[PDB]
Design a protein around this ligand. Structure first.
Ligand SMILES: [Zn+2]
Lengths: 124, 150, 55, 208, 100, 138
RNA sequence: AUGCGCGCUAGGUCUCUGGGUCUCCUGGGGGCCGAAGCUAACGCGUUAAGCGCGCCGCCUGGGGAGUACGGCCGCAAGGC
RNA sequence: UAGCGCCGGCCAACUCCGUGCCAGCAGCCGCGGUAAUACGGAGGGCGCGAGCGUUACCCGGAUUCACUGGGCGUAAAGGGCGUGUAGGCGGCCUGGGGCGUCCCAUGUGAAAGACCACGGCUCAACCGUGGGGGAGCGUGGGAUACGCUCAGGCUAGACG
């Protein structure tokens, strides 16, 4: 456009929208698990992905994902939610930190222990 | 006598009477790191033959580059199709700041210090052609004076 | 086509060009008629005589 | 701290006779004279053509491992050199050679940069008649790098300085062997160092 | 020093008061184009010797009223009515800019 | 209508140059002739003179080219490759002494309308004055 | 599927309408090829989609959606 | 005291077993149905190192709001068409003003932060002492080319 048009109207700045609205601008939220249900991937993938349903310290209540091999998630477990989205499952936008509040680190991990929080295995 | 460099191997397919028939194309840069650069694009049913054809084409199609202190006399910007390149002179001890294609092309030129930016479309072939054109469109003080003053 | 090929290989072009011709593609040009056999014969004869003499 | 562990494995990986292990890397045991291929299960296979990033990273790693300092310190030195004036490569190489440990190694008080680092850290070395015990200390032209009066009778320094008799030290360094003391004359030039590194790749690496 | 502005009288419908439209030009902060703006100042005149379409000159002064802080110094040029009707038409265009 | 005379002159020069004419005509003006003399001094044009066309003052500009090139496309190299107009009606561009651009590392020229007449970038820097930035030529 | 106004950049050919000294020159309007040039390409090309200037109106991934809410205009269907 | 991440391409690091669309990985493309360098574990390797990863937010990459630096025949984008208000823009030649514009001097632009130099903590972080730079705005003076304004003319635009 002309300089006059730019003076009169100008350019509008683009606004980013958060992909994790439930967190309310926090890295993590502590929630309470309600329903532990397995579901199916989108299309090319076929599995039984474990999904929790959690009510957070915020006003929100959103579906989560449980990463690892095995979990001890009950219907009343108090757990910390995390960022990250699963491409397969249509609706989940959050992960779970394994081994913080009620959840425990998936047993006998040996390679990637920072994720799936597990203590260093004692060798003898 | 001349150094050879590889840009890309791409495999293209044409349909036939119920079947896919392939062909290979190679973009190759040929230079001597003294101010001579050659770029060739060769299509052949096989990768070795494509490379050979590209080398041949590059050897035929050569450009002289007017270097000084291992850099470009003046800044330039050239658009080739929907792709734009920018070249700028740089002080000694800067390095070749470029993408894969411009860095590869300017390395064999003997250029040591340059600032570049790839704009518009970023098709490697078009970028390479734009770079070659930009190199072809460089003038020194002597050339400018000879044109103007005579 | 021949003119184009001569351009490609840096071979100087001599032509007996006429009204409907492009002077730019010809380095050494003879502006004359390319029809009317008389003219063609005259120019070619003179040129060939000069070539023979210059051997 | 710094890198602690095997040495000539780096010689192999870089594929150049890196003089890191003192004297053994001179005698036919540098692992370059025998088994000169990179370490690992696939060390002796046909290697694919390295990428631009691969080449630049290898160059930077080789240069860093020559001096054996932290990556953070290397980055800091690069930034300091870049922010300075003159040619970035030349200034960087000059700054890297100003380290006290490296100067000690160059003078011949030690057989290796690591041994020189240990000698500096343990306080055997003195600058301008004052004890300095920091490997990362930067020296200036016209500084006296000498051995402490306590460490003068050590067998290590004795053999080191006797073996340096009739041996030519760097042009920018002057050594008074009998006095067990040395001098820093000027910043070393690009040509002065016989480093198998093209600093342009280092500049290009840190550019991205 | 005290700020001095120049403008055209566009109102005299008040006792001992006139409305002066001060004109300002300045380059745009971003687009560099020279931009032209205007502002209205209530000026104090005790003698009522100034009329519409008079180019006057004002000076910063101690407050007289809520919106009065300027006094009239000198008449520069008179009968510049063109500016006055320009202002009036610009102002009168507003009725045609409503919604209801 | 015709809103910008100097832009018109630049466009005329460019258009005539791109078709390898020996001459071009532009309506006469003092500012135009000043620009023309500045261009001629730097050896961008062969020359100019004031002619009369159908009872109206005109300026005839003589264009300069390089030698006839070898091989395909034997058209001569241009002397004026690129001529833009910087300060246009509706957006005036002014620069101080510290902000006079260097065009093509000095291989080109920037023509300024300074308080001390129409100068180039070099003359403006030497004298130490700035003004309206008219055009850049390289 | 091409906003308006003005200026510059080879021509060839067919038409409508004027003027002159009437094989032809000179204006205006409508088509078809095509220099330079432009474009992702198709193509445009003195009736530019070329080279420039001034002003205006719009665009910022696809759906959801010309939908919902709010406002304005109509008898209504509906329109912005 | 030596740990942490990674080894399909981006992006530096490859083999053997368990596995058979299950368990699972994933930032994107996607990998897994018995010969997986992509899943799990080993050996090896790469990167950093008293740290290494993950999540949240900002900038960049994004020339993807484009003033520097975009576009509207067919990709998203010319208003259905006129007349016209405010506004924006504007022929040639002289003269007066110096509002924009340019230049010089000067006041301000606190300290701390940024830059340069030299120094004190054994080095560094940190700090100290000097020196500049600094968008902008007052104040005094100078210039008139281009905008502006004013006065007098011209016919190439426009109108009759
Ligand atoms: Zn070794």
């Amino acid at each position: 456009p002309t300089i006059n048009q730019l003076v009169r109207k100008g350019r509008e700045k683009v606004r980013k929208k958060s992909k994790v609205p439930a967190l309310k601008g926090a890295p993590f939220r502590r929630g309470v698990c309600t329903v532990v249900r397995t579901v199916t991937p989108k299309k090319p993938n076929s599995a039984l992905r474990k999904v929790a349903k959690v009510r957070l310290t915020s006003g929100y209540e959103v579906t989560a994902y449980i990463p690892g091999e095995g979990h001890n998630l009950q219907e009343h477990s108090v757990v910390l939610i995390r960022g990250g989205r699963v491409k397969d499952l249509p609706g989940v936008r959050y992960h779970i930190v394994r081994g913080v509040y009620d959840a425990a680190g998936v047993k006998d991990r040996k390679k990637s222990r920072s994720k799936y929080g597990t203590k260093k295995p004692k060798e003898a | 006598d001349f150094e050879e460099k590889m840009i890309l191997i791409r495999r293209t397919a044409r349909m036939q009477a119920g079947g896919r028939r392939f062909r290979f194309g190679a973009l190759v840069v040929v230079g001597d790191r003294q101010g001579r650069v050659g770029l060739g694009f060769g299509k052949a049913p096989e990768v070795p033959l494509a490379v050979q054809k590209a080398g041949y084409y590059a050897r035929r199609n050569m450009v002289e580059v007017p270097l000084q202190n291992g850099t470009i006399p003046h800044e330039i910007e050239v658009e080739f199709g929907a792709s734009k390149i920018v070249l700028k002179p740089a002080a000694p001890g800067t390095g070749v700041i470029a993408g894969a294609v411009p860095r590869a092309i300017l390395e064999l030129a003997g250029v040591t210090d340059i600032l570049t930016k790839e704009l518009g479309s970023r098709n490697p072939i078009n970028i390479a052609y734009a770079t070659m054109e930009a190199l072809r469109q460089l003038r020194t003080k002597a050339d400018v004076e000879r044109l103007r003053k005579g | 086509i021949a003119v184009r090929e001569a351009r490609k290989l840096f071979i100087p072009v001599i032509a007996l060009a006429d009204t409907d011709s492009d002077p730019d593609l010809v380095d050494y040009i003879i502006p004359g008629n390319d029809d009317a056999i008389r003219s063609i014969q005259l120019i070619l004869s003179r040129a060939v005589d000069l070539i023979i003499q210059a051997r | 701290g710094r890198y602690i562990g095997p040495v000539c494995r780096l010689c192999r990986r870089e594929g150049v006779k890196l003089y890191l292990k003192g004297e053994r890397c001179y005698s036919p045991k540098c692992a370059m004279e025998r088994r000169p291929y990179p370490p690992g299960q696939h060390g002796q296979k046909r290697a694919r053509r390295p990428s631009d990033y691969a080449v630049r990273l290898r160059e930077k790693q080789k240069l860093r491992r020559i001096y054996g300092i932290s990556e953070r310190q290397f980055r800091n030195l690069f930034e300091e050199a870049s922010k300075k004036k003159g040619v970035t490569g030349s200034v960087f190489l000059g700054l890297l050679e100003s380290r006290l440990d490296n100067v000690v190694y160059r003078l011949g008080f030690a057989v290796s940069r690591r041994q020189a680092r240990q000698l500096v850290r343990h306080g055997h070395i003195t600058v301008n008649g004052r004890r300095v015990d920091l490997p990362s200390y930067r020296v200036r032209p016209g500084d006296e790098i000498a051995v402490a009066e306590k460490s003068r009778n050590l067998e290590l320094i004795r053999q080191n300085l006797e073996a340096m008799k009739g041996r030519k030290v760097g042009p920018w360094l002057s050594l008074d062997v009998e006095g067990m003391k040395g001098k820093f004359l000027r910043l070393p030039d690009r040509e002065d160092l016989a480093l198998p590194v093209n600093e342009q790749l280092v500049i290009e690496f840190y550019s991205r | 020093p005290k700020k001095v502005l120049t403008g055209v009288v566009v109102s005299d419908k008040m006792q001992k008061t006139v409305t002066v439209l001060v004109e300002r030009q300045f380059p745009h902060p971003l687009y560099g184009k020279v931009i032209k703006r205007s502002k209205k100042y209530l000026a104090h005149d005790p003698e009522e010797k100034y009329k519409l379409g008079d180019v006057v000159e004002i000076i910063e002064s101690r407050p007289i009223s809520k919106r009065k802080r300027f006094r009239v110094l000198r008449l520069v040029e008179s009968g510049r009515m063109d500016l006055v009707e320009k202002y009036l038409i610009r102002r009168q265009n507003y009725e045609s800019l409503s919604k209801r | 209508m015709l809103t910008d005379p100097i832009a018109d002159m630049l466009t005329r020069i460019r258009n005539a140059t791109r078709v390898y004419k020996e001459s071009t005509d532009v309506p006469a003006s003092r500012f135009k002739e000043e620009i023309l003399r500045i261009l001629a001094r730097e050896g961008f044009i062969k020359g100019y003179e004031r002619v009369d066309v159908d009872g109206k003052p005109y300026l005839r500009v003589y264009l300069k080219y390089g030698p006839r090139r070898q091989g395909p496309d034997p058209r001569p190299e241009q002397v004026i490759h690129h001529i833009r107009r910087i300060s246009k009606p509706g957006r005036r561009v002014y620069v101080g002494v510290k902000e006079i651009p260097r065009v093509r590392r000095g291989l080109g020229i920037a023509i300024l309308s300074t308080s001390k007449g129409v100068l180039t970038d070099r003359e403006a820097r030497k004298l130490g004055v700035g003004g309206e930035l008219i055009c850049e030529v390289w």
